[PDB]
């Protein structure tokens, strides 16, 4: 189990820019 | 143990936020 460590700010960040280029 | 909590320890991968989106 090796993932990216992404706290708050990081983590939120990562998440809308994915689901928004998603959506794009 | 949340998602977003446990990020800052365990990690969530590229696919799990996919899972979110």
Known sequence: ?24 | QDLQTLCCTDGCSMTDLSALC
Request: charged share 25%; aromatic share 12%.
């Open chain 1, 1 to 24: 189990k090796e993932s990216v460590r992404l706290c708050g700010l990081e983590y939120i960040r990562t998440v809308i820019y994915i689901c928004a280029s998603s959506r794009w």
